[PDB]
Design a protein around this ligand. Structure first.
Ligand SMILES: Nc1ncnc2c1ncn2[C@@H]1O[C@H](COP(=O)(O)OP(=O)(O)OP(=O)(O)O)[C@@H](O)[C@H]1O
Ligand SMILES: Nc1ncnc2c1ncn2[C@@H]1O[C@H](COP(=O)(O)OP(=O)(O)OP(=O)(O)O)[C@@H](O)[C@H]1O
Ligand SMILES: Nc1ncnc2c1ncn2[C@@H]1O[C@H](COP(=O)(O)OP(=O)(O)OP(=O)(O)O)[C@@H](O)[C@H]1O
Ligand SMILES: Nc1ncnc2c1ncn2[C@@H]1O[C@H](COP(=O)(O)OP(=O)(O)OP(=O)(O)O)[C@@H](O)[C@H]1O
Ligand SMILES: Nc1ncnc2c1ncn2[C@@H]1O[C@H](COP(=O)(O)OP(=O)(O)O)[C@@H](O)[C@H]1O
Lengths: 17, 526, 492, 243
């Protein structure tokens, strides 16, 4: 099982010209 | 160049030698003829850290050193605020943290600003390089940027960082070493002397005022207050002033009336009463649950046994060829073994004493029942000197007469911890209770215990009658009715069973108390 | 020439050798050992080239593309100097630190993190793509090689990998010579300084950690509390080493040996000479690759002290002591794990002596309802017999208080040339040992002497040494009577 | 196909009749396998007292056959493993062996593998039954695999009903007679005839029972300062086993 694998992700695009 | 010239050792008491270490590590290389410092060729230190347990004023050092040094005010880091979602920003906040410093390094480099940063709660920001703490995303690894800025290719001799933790070992191996974090030292639970000094600092302003702290006797308060420290210690008076003035503030209506009375004194007995409300980190206050009616001295045996107790105490206190000493006190059931093992501690007056017992753990498997014991004895080793009690060996290592049954890992851990002395210079006392000793003989622990005591139980009426004059609840008429019958009987029974039977027998009837007392006493004995 | 490093000629020559145009130089090992001073020296010693200070994960930007833009801008050599000057030979160098945050196995690791957060592909592909840009050189310093070594290496680009970081038990002298050069040239350092004397306590105390004490020895002399100048004494060094700094020390022993070894009779000399003979048997003989002995005694005579004495008497590279003192609670499987760990350490070392103390409480023996740890027993028993690979040699010495159980379980046969430790033989030995210790004096000795010959005595010295203390505490009048009372209580 | 000097580091000696007596039948049984149509597999014991050197004898038998595929199943590589992974490894070894054309496999220190202790007999029956099935498990194909067991004591195996599953057995007696003892010592070349005369008078008259792996150890233990007087040490050491 290995339950509670809750994870979070980050913005790395920051689309801008 | 030099600090603000107004420090004069303000803010702290109880930590003197560690702040001296701070002088001679941090400020020495700064405060000296700098020509001769060029003659030295030693770069200045950066990277203090403070890994004290909660309380004990680590933060206040981290504030007062900044108050001392004359430079731009230190850029606080109130825990993690560098972290942000957009990757690169978490890593790059630190360059902004160091930019002015390296600017002053490059431009106007010789005599410098000597900027400082506090960098509190490293336990959040730093970890074991991302391997530990689950799967910590690479956002977590800002330690790499920090490392490279503090001791990487480009070097800084103009700034110092400070650290503050409650759990240092969680930090990676890398930072703690010299060049990155030069000095590491705990802030310990202070001794009685330092506790007096700190309490004196908090009370000093009021004592200076004419109308406050009458009859407070801070030295008495110090010897009373055993393990209170730091924040707990000053929170005591932060509650005592309040208890002193609740008398005045309420007179329960809309308006609150204390205006006429500003003569407030903050009396002693308020602080003494106040001691009851705070609870310290170590749950040692509840002695009563073990000793609910204390020890009544009946005959010579208790005297002799406690004399052996103080003998043994002063033995370990004085000698170095026995840094450890180990003894059970054997008795039959219901003979006050636990209590009479607590009283020797109360006589011993050691700093660190703890009672390990199944009463603390009721339904823990043998493994956790071992690791708890391991924690306890590790803390005792961590102290200079201590007294550990193991109550009901028979229960800690489980024991049942039907078949040979017990938990052997408990026993192995306990026996090993008996033979294992503490480190050099430390000392220890360990003492145990059991209602059963033939078992311990069978399983070869009575060897490991250095010596023994056989605590008796009440054997004859010339003991019982004096024990019964003690403990009240009786008078001479019942006593005379008893004395003839008891003298022939020469009863053998234990005190706990006595103290129970007496209460139940007496509950029934004002007249018929003895007719029940002796009637049930016929059962036990003969 | 080697200046500022002072650590080792070995790697300073070996990295350059069979390298020098190479691309991909990588440097790892434990933290320290001047991996930065490598750059700070060689960049200057080479032809006056840009150091190119780079701060590792600084390349990461929130915007797309700027991350790769930085590292393609950074090189500035393949663009022009590949052709310019008619050189076809560059000197530019790029140095990166803490590369682990920059690199991962294939991008999906430690959270399956996104494509623009994890692009190693750019640098994986530059060298092994359009061409091998061989006009420059990269230096990668990783203090944690396990994370990136497994999945970031291709041979020819990154075949180069060299472990670094030995203490250099004589080269640390040369190291600290630099940072003491100015204190020696300037009339600061002491006359009583023996530099080898202060450094030989630094077996595992690494040269990187070996400048904090020097700053502290300068500073304790500087120390003025709440004039005299240039007092750089030697007093500071030993206090600095014992208290402010200890690191990667990983060395704990010689606390089982306590109060020393006292020759209270011929048996002690006998057993020690036998152990000496046996260690010589190990050392000077083939076809005896491992030796295994058990010394039985009754309890409280003392056997772990004897085993540690036999260890410390003989110079070895590898000695380790297995006790439950460290691994209480560690269950039947973790115990054998630790045991095979230290025996593999021995099998790596070229010549070693391991000790096991108190197997009777290591393998969890209890007399009633007899039970023990079958698995650790059966592992230990095969370890006694498992020879190392070849040419290296091993000793395994064991203590216990009970060998009847071992004979019953056939451990005894597997042991080789077992021996017997005695209790205190008689009161003659007892009282001469008392006078050897010096806890008693001749008058009370003579007083004890009255009741010696009438009764023979079988007692262990550990018990004797505990037993004397309570009587010593007791007043001088009731001292000897209590002592003799306990002695007639136990051992009659 | 390792070199297997780790299991034979000193060497193999025919100290007397019994060595040729055993390995004759060993190679005989090998040829029997190689020309067996009925029985694809066989299983032998090299039983004897514990210091007989039976392990080394098994290895010599294997390398004299020179099969393509031969491997060990031993605790020295299977250490600290719980019973289910011990069984898994000693099973996958045979699963790798079945596919080769023909082979011998050897299992050494069956008892230490089986986790046998005599205080109150206990062990892992799991590996036991895993082994009792693998003794008799014929490969699916005609290919032949033989088995070499290296037990230390036999009564317990026949107490667990194991020999009846094994095809056959060998008794490997250790050094029995002082003249054969003396001949092995002469082969090993430690002492000269000068000392050997004293050895001849002292132990030649009375037969002695000693294991050879204990012998070659204790001669090295008495080797130190051998010229003046270590023969008496050797003699007193030998006296307590053999008498
Ligand atoms: N001289 C002193 N010694 C010890 N403690 C003091 C002293 N003077 C004041 N204090 C108290 O110490 C507290 C500081 O808390 P401290 O930082 O020691 O706790 P902490 O658990 O280390 O906090 P954190 O771990 O979150 O940084 C103050 O709230 C203050 O009341
Ligand atoms: N020396 C003593 N004299 C008189 N009373 C005693 C003495 N010691 C303890 N007591 C009384 O005994 C009570 C505590 O009993 P205790 O918990 O020691 O029993 P116990 O040791 O748990 O019994 P058992 O070991 O049979 O389980 C206390 O309330 C106390 O008043
Ligand atoms: N050469 C010696 N002769 C006699 N006693 C010694 C010698 N060397 C050390 N000792 C004593 O032996 C004691 C410790 O012995 P050791 O710890 O090896 O056995 P032990 O663990 O006490 O035995 P057990 O495991 O049966 O309790 C020390 O207190 C020390 O005084
Ligand atoms: N005739 C012989 N045949 C094979 N080996 C011999 C002979 N004579 C001496 N030896 C030696 O005996 C050693 C092998 O011993 P072996 O491994 O059989 O003991 P063991 O059976 O493992 O003991 P235990 O069963 O108690 O583990 C080898 O080192 C080898 O040189
Ligand atoms: N001979 C030496 N060996 C190891 N470290 C040294 C030596 N000489 C100086 N140093 C110190 O080493 C530090 C650089 O070490 P570095 O290689 O960066 O360690 P890490 O690899 O742990 O970051 C410098 O701050 C310097 O004080």
């Amino acid at each position: 099982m290995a339950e509670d694998a809750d994870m979070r992700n980050e913005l790395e695009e920051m689309q801008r010209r | 160049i030099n600090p603000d010239w107004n420090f004069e050792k303000m803010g702290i008491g109880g930590l003197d030698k560690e702040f001296s270490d701070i002088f001679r590590r941090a400020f020495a290389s700064r405060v000296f003829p700098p020509e001769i410092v060029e003659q030295m060729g030693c770069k200045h230190v950066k990277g203090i850290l403070l890994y004290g347990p909660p309380g004990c004023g680590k933060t206040l050092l981290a504030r007062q050193i900044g108050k001392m040094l004359n430079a731009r005010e230190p850029k606080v880091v109130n825990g993690p605020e560098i972290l942000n979602k957009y990757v690169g920003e978490s890593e790059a906040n630190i360059r902004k943290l160091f930019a002015d410093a390296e600017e002053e390094q490059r431009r106007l480099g010789a005599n410098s600003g000597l900027h400082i940063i506090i960098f509190d709660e490293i336990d959040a920001i730093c970890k074991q390089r991302g391997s530990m703490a689950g799967s910590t995303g690479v956002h977590d690894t800002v330690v790499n940027q920090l490392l490279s800025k503090i001791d990487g290719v480009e070097q800084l001799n103009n700034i110092l960082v400070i650290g503050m933790t409650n759990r240092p070992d969680l930090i990676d191996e890398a930072l703690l070493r010299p060049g990155r974090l030069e000095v590491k030292m705990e802030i310990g639970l202070p001794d009685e002397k330092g506790r007096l000094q700190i309490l004196h600092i908090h009370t000093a302003r009021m004592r200076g005022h004419q109308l406050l702290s009458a009859d407070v006797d801070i030295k008495e308060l110090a010897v009373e207050t055993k393990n209170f420290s730091g924040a707990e210690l000053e929170g005591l008076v932060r509650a005592a002033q309040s208890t002193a003035m609740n008398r005045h503030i309420i007179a329960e209506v809309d308006m609150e009336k204390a205006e006429s009375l500003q003569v407030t004194r903050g009396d002693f007995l308020a602080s003494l009463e106040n001691d009851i409300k705070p609870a310290f980190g170590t749950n040692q206050e509840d002695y009563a649950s073990y000793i609910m009616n204390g020890i009544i001295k009946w005959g010579d045996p208790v005297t002799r046994v406690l004399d052996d107790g103080e003998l043994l105490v002063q033995q370990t206190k004085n000698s170095d060829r026995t840094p450890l000493v180990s003894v059970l006190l054997e008795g039959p059931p219901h003979s006050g073994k636990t209590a009479l093992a607590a009283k020797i501690a109360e006589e011993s007056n050691f700093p660190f004493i703890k009672i390990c017992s199944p009463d603390k753990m009721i339904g823990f498997s043998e493994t956790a029942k071992c690791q708890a014991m391991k924690k306890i004895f590790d803390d005792a080793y961590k102290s200079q000197l201590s007294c550990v009690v193991v109550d009901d060996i028979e229960r800690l290592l489980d024991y049942v007469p039907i078949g040979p049954r017990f938990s052997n890992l408990v026993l192995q851990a306990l026996l090993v911890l008996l033979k294992k002395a503490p480190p050099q210079g430390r000392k220890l006392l360990i003492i145990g209770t059991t209602s059963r000793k033939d078992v311990l003989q069978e399983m070869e622990m009575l060897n490991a215990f250095s010596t023994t005591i056989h605590v008796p139980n009440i054997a004859t009426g010339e003991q019982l009658l004096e024990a019964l004059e003690l403990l009240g609840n009786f008078k001479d008429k019942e006593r005379t009715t008893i004395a003839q019958q008891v003298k022939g009987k020469k009863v053998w029974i234990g005190i706990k069973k006595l103290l129970m039977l007496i209460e139940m027998s007496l509950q029934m009837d004002p007249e018929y108390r003895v007719r029940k007392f002796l009637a049930l006493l016929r059962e036990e004995g003969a």
